[PDB]
Amino acid sequence: EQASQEVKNWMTETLLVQN
Amino acid sequence: EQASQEVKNWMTETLLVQN
Known part of the structure; x- marks a missing residue:
């Protein structure tokens, strides 16, 4: 997961x- | 500097x- 809502x-x- | 379950x-x- 390169980016995900919170992570993004x-x-x-x-x-x-x-x- | 920041971590959260998924982020961690x-x-x-x-x-x-x-x-």
Whole structure:
């Protein structure tokens, strides 16, 4: 599961800010 | 920095394998 609702939110937001 | 059941499973397993 590369991304999933909750996971997608963190994956994008978290990584988005980092990058 | 953040983990939640599903997120924890991926965060650990996914990152565990990577590292």
